[PDB]
Amino acid sequence: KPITIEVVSMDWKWFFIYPEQGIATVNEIAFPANTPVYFKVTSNSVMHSFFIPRLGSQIYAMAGMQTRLHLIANEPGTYDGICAEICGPGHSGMKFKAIATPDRAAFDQWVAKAKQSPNTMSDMAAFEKLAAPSEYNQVEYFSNVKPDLFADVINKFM
């Protein structure tokens, strides 16, 4: 089973959503190796560029629209992610890490850990507070997420 990951590029950090499992994160994602991954991408501000050099994969993120990317990580390990288009002050620290696990069980562990988080992203005041301008954000998980947050974000521009 391929995993679907939603991505919202914010002013100088990446917000990730896992619609299926009901968890969200900041600057870090995990998923099984040799497994298909579908990234549904958008931006809540200016235009950014989602890039992962060691997988040779890239895609732009613009407000109001949804872009798509598909990929398979051939080997387990962490892969560095960067924002490849100048977008202001925190351009250089607008990075993320992707962890391709050795199996699904290991991926299901990362997820469980995410569910043990006290932070949630289940309302309007949570999302906009996160969206506010910050730089070099450290990893962060959210145990819950608003049911249709991706669409909600996009349609603010629609």
Ligand code: CUA
């Ligand atoms: Cu976003 Cu550089």
